[model samples]
Target chain A: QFNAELEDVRSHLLAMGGLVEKQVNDAVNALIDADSGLAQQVREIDDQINQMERNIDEECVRILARRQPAASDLRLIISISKSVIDLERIGDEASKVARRAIQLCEEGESPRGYVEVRHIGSQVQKMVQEALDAFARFDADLALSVAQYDKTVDREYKTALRELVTYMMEDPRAISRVLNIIWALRSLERIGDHARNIAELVIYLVRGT
Target chain B: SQQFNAELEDVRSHLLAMGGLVEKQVNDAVNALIDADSGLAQQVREIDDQINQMERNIDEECVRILARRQPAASDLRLIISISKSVIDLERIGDEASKVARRAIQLCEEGESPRGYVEVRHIGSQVQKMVQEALDAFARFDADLALSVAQYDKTVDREYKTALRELVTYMMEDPRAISRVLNIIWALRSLERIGDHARNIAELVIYLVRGT
Candidate 1:
């Protein structure tokens, strides 16, 4: 019965993880394709992510109170609970990016940083998926790979920021528009950070170090 | 159970110590920015390693207690709270380090601080929030923690106000956008620090009420 309960929590977690992964994927698509409808959908999906976090957290607490899981089992519960927090935050960032996508579409004719957005967006989305896979399989190798890739994402973010600043300097009128892109890039970078965080949790879960 | 109690208390104290260090790092980072003190900024940046080490240490202690004691009920909640708060405190330290890095950059740029007012005001506000959040955790004061959570709303508004002011400043002197954007990033970090402090406060409430 105790093993069954742990399995149930793990299943629900992967379910939540899947939703978060889709949210990131769709939000990036909304931005790149200028799909406001898709962007709005991401907003609604965020509420579900929030609810899932609460549910998974409560389940963890219940398991802790009733079953009194110890050692590796306890760490699994702790890591899952912590991983949900990052997944929820990643969903939040995706929603923010979606909002920016909608705003940019309304403002008409997007700006120069799409190349950076597309590149970094895909990288972080991959990180999110790989992080989830690492958790699912308890694969420290994949988790380590996700962590290393995060460094690349961070470098790309700074490079994009500097380039965007130059674009704004070239034409002051686009400062506001370019700033929106900058915000999206910032959100994307944060998504990468959250994914890396989840990956780290997976590593801890596996190594206990 | 007594052993569990002692271990729990030990981990909680370490968490509070980590919180105190994070709070100090935040304050020093802000002061470094406001005073443009490169030396202080370097110190704040360097202190992040210590904060990271503290987090890993407290986390290991929490895991050990959970494994050895198999604590349930409020004891379990307390361990979980300490573990979560350590993460919040570590992120707060990271944001402070980012602010310190920006401070160093600004010092090198040699521009008169155009957004110093916003930096000082918001910086001090978030610093107080961090201190109060840690105090709430230390005493298990849910009421104080709620106040910290509520105070975060004010910080958010103040951050928006500062952003608008800086945006106008940037618009007025387009050439100043680069430096102003750096200030904007620093302000963003301060605002994020406020959010982390609020998260810590929320963890305090969770610890006390087990909700």
Candidate 2:
């Protein structure tokens, strides 16, 4: 029965991860296309993520209180709580992108040089996915590499931002619209960092370091 | 019980000292922005490194207690609360460092005689929110922490208000766009600090109610 209960948490967290990944994908697609309606959907999904996080948190507490899980069992529950928090935060970051999507849509989205924006979006989305996969397989090396994978995303984001800044300097007309893109891109960078943090948590669980 | 309490108390003081240093960093960094004081920026960097070290200490402290004590329900909740909220606290310092970065950048480029006054407003407001959130956690006041969440919304309003007005100013005077843009980035971190404070409030709620 304790074994079944433990599986329950592991699976539910995976379920929550699924929800978060969908939100991240939808939020990015909505931004790339200027789809306010899809963005609204992404915005509404955050409450569900929060609900899942709280549910998982409560379940962990219940298990700890009743079953008195020790060693690896305790470690497993603790890691779940930590990752749940990070997953919910990933949801919040998706909402940030969705919010920018709405604002940029309403402003008529002077697209400018945002082609690389899509690149950053998809890169972080992949990182989030691989990080979740690492958690599922309990592969510490994979988890570490997922953390390692964020460097390229950061490099691309930095290059694009530098270009964005120089382009804005060249012409003031683009500043208003490009600024939204900057915020969206920055949000993507942060999402990468969050993924890296989750990877670290996974590694912590496997290696206790 | 007493040993566990002592361990916990030591961690708490570490958190408080870290919090105190972070608040000073935010305060000084913003003032440094307006004053165009590079020396102030230098000092801010040193304090921030200490903040990082402090976070490592608190984190190690919590993990030690977790491993050694095997705390029961109440203590478990408290331990996890600090364990989780420490992340939020550290990120708050990172936001202040974001301000410090902008301050240093502006000083290097060229001094603006009168810097963006709006940053000072946003900085103090969120710093107070951070301050109050820390207090609420210390006192175990879930209600006060919830109020801190409400206060976060106010800071958000301030952030948007300043960002929009400054954007308009940028269009009117294109020469100021870069300066305005840097200020925008600083306010962005300040706005994020407000979010981190609310995260702390949620941890407070979690501790009190076991959510």
Candidate 3:
């Protein structure tokens, strides 16, 4: 009976997903180009993501209380709640990346590596996009596949960090600059983690695990 | 109403018990670090599975309540908030275990020579924030929740300050980079504990005001 309302919630969720995906893209682009302007735009975009989360949250809560959705519907609504949190967190991570971008942009001279970050960054973005796509399609298989990408991101992060650590060790002056980049890499790793969390939630939504 | 209330109360008491348990876990993690007690660190690690299990148990309880009782409005909000709070609590447990792991790592190094840093100050305040957040949820005190949320900023400031100092220290002495990173990670974990506590306080506001 309330299928129309469920559709509304699902649509808003996808809309939120789209915004978060853009956040990831913008943050990565800002870092790549050393575009402080674009980075600030990403930071500004966070309030909008937060607002969407709040609205969709109330919607899901209302449906749970009013519709008393059971079985599949109940799982779907609960998954939305969980997904909303991660999406917001993804936005936060993106904002952090943007701030680091601005800091890097302000730097006088430092070796910037888009090489490793782009590898892990693009992979993590794909994972989140595919997770949301899996949710939209209700495909647990796709969600599980997306979850597999986390290890790839992990490996990329570790390899890059080893290089960064060596670079830091060799040059005392570069240590501060390298450390900021380390924080950015670490945030990207966590973004992957949160994306995996969302994928697992998607699986739970489909199979009630 | 009575049955639903009873069910909710069961959920609440179980969650609070887990809360109390994890608070101690957080403390023990700090103590393990401060005192360099690998045994205490191991204890926090060993007991973590049970805490995570409790979190999942409490999660399912909320699902059952929503399915059967179908609580509306405030009741619905409270139930949902409790579910969210447990995740936060479980995360706090994970952060505690992270601290314990760091403690073990620090212990392995064995008296390298570093002063007692300000981690204890930031840590005790973090512990206080968790307690106050849990208490706010218990008594449904909106004001207390607001204060808890406010307190997190201080934790954030403290974390940033310590992080900057540690970074400086590492730069000054590259020989201690690995050890300093450990302390940095431990402090980062403590900072996350503060964030989780802030989240719970926000949940309290949500439950009380329906936002």
Q: Which candidate number would show the highest lDDT if scored against the true structure?
A: 1
lDDT per residue as tens, model 1, A97-155: 99999988888645688888999999999999999999899899999999889999999
Candidate 1 off by > 4 Å = none
**What is candidate 2's lDDT per residue for A1-209, written digit by digit as tens?**
56888899888999999989999999999988999999999989899999999899888877766654455666677677888988988999899999999988988875474588788888889889989999988889989998998888888987897778777778878777888888888888888988888898789788877
Candidate 1 residue A33 C-alpha distance from true site, Å = 1.6
lDDT of 1 by residue, B47-140 (tens): 9999999998887777778777457678878887888888899999999999998889888776634889888899999999999998898898
TM-score of chain B in each prediction: 0.97, 0.92, 0.97
Q: List the per-model TM-score of the A chain.
A: 0.97, 0.94, 0.95
Model 2 TM-score, 2 decimals: 0.88
Across all models, the iRMS values in order are 1.9, 3.3, 1.6
Question: Which candidate's TM-score is highest?
Answer: 1
Off by over 4 Å in 3: B109-116, B209-211
For model 3 chain A, the run of ten residues with the poorest summed lDDT: A108-117
TM-score of every model?
A: 0.96, 0.88, 0.92
The DockQ ranking, best first, is 1, 3, 2
Looking at model 1, how many pairs of residues clash?
A: 0
